[PDB]
mmCIF file of C-alpha atoms in Angstrom:
data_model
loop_
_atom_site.group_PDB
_atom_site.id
_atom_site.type_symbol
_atom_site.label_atom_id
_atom_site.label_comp_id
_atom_site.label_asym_id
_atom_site.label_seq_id
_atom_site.Cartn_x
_atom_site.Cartn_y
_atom_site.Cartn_z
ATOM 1 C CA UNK L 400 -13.628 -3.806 7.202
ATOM 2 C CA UNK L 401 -12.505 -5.781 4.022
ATOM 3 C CA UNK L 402 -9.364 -7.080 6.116
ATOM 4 C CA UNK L 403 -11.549 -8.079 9.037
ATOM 5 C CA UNK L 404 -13.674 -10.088 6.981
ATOM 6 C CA UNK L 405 -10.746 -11.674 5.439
ATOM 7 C CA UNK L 406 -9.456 -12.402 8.862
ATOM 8 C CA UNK L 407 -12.499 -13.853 9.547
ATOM 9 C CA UNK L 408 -12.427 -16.230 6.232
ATOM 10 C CA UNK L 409 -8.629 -17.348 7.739
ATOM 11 C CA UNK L 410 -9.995 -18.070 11.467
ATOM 12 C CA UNK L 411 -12.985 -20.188 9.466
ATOM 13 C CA UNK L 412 -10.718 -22.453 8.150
ATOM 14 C CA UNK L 413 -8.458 -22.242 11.058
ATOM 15 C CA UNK L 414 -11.144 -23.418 13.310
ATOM 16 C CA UNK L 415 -11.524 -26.599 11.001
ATOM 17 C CA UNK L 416 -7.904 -27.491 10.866
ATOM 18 C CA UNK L 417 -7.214 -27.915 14.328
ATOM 19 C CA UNK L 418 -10.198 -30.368 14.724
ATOM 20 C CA UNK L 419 -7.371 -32.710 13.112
ATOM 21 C CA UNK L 420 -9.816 -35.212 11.645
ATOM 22 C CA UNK L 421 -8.892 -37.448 9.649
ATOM 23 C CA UNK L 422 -10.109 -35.568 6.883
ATOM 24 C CA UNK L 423 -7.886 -32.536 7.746
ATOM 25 C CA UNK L 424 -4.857 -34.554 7.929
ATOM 26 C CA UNK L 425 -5.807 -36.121 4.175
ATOM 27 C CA UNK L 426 -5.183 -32.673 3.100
ATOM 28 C CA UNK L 427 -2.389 -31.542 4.903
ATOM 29 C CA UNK L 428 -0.102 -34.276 3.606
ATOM 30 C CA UNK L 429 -1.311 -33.602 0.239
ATOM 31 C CA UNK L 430 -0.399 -29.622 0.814
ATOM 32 C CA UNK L 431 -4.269 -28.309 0.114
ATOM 33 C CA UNK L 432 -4.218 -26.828 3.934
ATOM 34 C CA UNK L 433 -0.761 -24.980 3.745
ATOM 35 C CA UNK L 434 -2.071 -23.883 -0.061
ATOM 36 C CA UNK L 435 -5.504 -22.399 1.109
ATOM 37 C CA UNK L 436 -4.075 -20.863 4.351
ATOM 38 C CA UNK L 437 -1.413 -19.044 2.011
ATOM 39 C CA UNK L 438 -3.974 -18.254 0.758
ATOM 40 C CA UNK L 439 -6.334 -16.764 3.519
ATOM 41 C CA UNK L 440 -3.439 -15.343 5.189
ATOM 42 C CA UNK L 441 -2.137 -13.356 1.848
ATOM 43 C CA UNK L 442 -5.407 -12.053 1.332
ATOM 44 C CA UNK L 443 -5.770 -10.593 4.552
ATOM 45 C CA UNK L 444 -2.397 -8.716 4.873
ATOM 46 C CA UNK L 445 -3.032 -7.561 0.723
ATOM 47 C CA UNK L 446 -6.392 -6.159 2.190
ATOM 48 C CA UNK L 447 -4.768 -5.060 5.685
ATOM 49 C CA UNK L 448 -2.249 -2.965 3.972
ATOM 50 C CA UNK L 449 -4.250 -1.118 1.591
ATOM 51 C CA UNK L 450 -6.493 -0.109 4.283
ATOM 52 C CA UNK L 451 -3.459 1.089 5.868
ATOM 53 C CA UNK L 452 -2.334 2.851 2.976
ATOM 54 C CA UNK L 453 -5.972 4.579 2.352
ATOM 55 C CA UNK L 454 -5.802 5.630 5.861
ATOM 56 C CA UNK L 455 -2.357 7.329 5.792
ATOM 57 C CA UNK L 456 -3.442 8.685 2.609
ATOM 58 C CA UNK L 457 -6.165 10.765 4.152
ATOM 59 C CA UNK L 458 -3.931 12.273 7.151
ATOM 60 C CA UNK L 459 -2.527 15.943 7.384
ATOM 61 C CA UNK L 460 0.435 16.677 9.112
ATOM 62 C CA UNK L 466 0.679 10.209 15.506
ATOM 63 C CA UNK L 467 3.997 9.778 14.420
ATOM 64 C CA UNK L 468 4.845 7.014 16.637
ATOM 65 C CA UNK L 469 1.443 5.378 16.895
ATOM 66 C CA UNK L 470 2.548 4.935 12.897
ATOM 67 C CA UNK L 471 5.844 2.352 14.310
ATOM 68 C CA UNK L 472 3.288 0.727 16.785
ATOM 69 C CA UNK L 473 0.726 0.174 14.380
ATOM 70 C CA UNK L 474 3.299 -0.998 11.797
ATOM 71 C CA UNK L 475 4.539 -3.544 14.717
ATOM 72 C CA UNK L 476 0.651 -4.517 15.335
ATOM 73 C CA UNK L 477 0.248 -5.169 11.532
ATOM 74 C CA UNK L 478 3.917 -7.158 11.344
ATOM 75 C CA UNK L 479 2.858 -9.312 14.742
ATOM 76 C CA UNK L 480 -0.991 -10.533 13.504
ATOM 77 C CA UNK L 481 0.960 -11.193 10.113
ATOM 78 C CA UNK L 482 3.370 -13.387 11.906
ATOM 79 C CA UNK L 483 0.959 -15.217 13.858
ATOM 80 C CA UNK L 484 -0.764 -16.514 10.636
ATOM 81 C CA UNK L 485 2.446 -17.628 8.951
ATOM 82 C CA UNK L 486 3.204 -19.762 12.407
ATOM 83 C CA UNK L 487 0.013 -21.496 11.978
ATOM 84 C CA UNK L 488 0.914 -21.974 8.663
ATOM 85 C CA UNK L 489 4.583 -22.844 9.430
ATOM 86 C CA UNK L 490 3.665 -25.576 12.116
ATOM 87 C CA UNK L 491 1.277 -27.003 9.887
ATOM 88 C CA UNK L 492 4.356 -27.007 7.110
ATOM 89 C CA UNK L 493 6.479 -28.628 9.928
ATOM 90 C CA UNK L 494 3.721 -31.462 10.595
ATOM 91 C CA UNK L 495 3.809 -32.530 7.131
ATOM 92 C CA UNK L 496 7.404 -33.117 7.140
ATOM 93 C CA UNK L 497 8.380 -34.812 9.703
ATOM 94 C CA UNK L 498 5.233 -36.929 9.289
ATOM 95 C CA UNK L 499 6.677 -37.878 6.046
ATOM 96 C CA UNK L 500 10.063 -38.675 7.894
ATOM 97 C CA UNK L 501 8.415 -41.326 9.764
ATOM 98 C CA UNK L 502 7.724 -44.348 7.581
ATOM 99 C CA UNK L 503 3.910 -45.224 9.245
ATOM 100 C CA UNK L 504 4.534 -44.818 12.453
ATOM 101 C CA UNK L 505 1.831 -43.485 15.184
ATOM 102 C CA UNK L 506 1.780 -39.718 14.199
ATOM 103 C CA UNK L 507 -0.677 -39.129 17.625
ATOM 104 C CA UNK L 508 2.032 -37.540 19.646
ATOM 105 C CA UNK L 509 2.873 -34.875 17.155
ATOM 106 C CA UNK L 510 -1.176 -34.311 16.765
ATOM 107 C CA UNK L 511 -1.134 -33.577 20.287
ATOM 108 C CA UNK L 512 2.075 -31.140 20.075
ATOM 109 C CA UNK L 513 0.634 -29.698 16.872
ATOM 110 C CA UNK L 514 -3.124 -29.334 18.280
ATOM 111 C CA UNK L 515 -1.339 -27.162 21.491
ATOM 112 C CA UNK L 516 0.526 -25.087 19.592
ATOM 113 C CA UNK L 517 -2.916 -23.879 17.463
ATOM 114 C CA UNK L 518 -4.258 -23.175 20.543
ATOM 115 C CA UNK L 519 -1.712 -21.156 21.900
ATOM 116 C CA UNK L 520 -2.048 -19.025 18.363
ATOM 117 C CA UNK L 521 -5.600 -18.618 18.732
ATOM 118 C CA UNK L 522 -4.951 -16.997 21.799
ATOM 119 C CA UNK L 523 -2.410 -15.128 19.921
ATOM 120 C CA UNK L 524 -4.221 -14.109 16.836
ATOM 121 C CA UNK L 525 -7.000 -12.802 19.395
ATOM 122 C CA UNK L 526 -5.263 -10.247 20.680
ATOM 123 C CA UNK L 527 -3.454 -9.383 18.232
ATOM 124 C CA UNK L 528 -6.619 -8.693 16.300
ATOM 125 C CA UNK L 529 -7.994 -6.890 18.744
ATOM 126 C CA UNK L 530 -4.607 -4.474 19.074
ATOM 127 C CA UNK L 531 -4.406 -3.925 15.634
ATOM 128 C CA UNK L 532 -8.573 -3.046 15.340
ATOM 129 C CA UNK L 533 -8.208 -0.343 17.794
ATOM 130 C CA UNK L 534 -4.699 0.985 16.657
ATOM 131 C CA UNK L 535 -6.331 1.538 13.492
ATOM 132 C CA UNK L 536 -9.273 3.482 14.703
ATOM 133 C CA UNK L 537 -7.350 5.627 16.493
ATOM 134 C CA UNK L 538 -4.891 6.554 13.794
ATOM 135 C CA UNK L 539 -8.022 7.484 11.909
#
């Protein structure tokens, strides 16, 4: 699918984020990461919903597998605006902090990717199926 491989464009950079190098954090104070993952991330619900809306488009007259998949598409949408979110929330309090050692709130922010990895994994994975059903 379009929106899969967009998905797959978003996890690519993803995957080079959380490696935190010092590269990575270069351009996260300087707001390129939180720009391209806007990006990434908008591109994949824009392609997400007009599958969606092709699929609907095609169906006679499920009704409630509509609300789930509605919830499925809302929840993998929300996971990639956390990543994006905590990587906002890095920035600024990094800024807050005159020089200091920043390596505790790598840690916290490097945990919290991987706990929406997990995330964005199965919430993938629900939303694939949900959609194959429904068509």
């Amino acid at each position: 699918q379009r929106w899969e491989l967009a998905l797959g464009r978003f996890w690519d950079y993803l995957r080079w984020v959380q490696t935190l190098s010092e590269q990575v954090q270069e351009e996260l104070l300087s707001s390129q990461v939180t720009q391209e993952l806007r990006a990434l991330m908008d591109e994949t619900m824009k392609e997400l919903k007009a599958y969606k809306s092709e699929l609907e488009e095609q169906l006679t007259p499920r009704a409630r597998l509509s609300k789930e998949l509605q919830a499925a598409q809302a929840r993998l949408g929300a996971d990639m605006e956390d990543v994006r979110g905590r990587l906002v929330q890095y920035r600024g309090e990094v800024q807050a902090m005159l020089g200091q050692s920043t390596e505790e709130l790598r840690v916290r922010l490097a945990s919290h990717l991987r706990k929406l990895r997990k995330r964005l994994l199965r919430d993938a994975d629900d939303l694939q199926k949900r959609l194959a059903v429904y068509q």
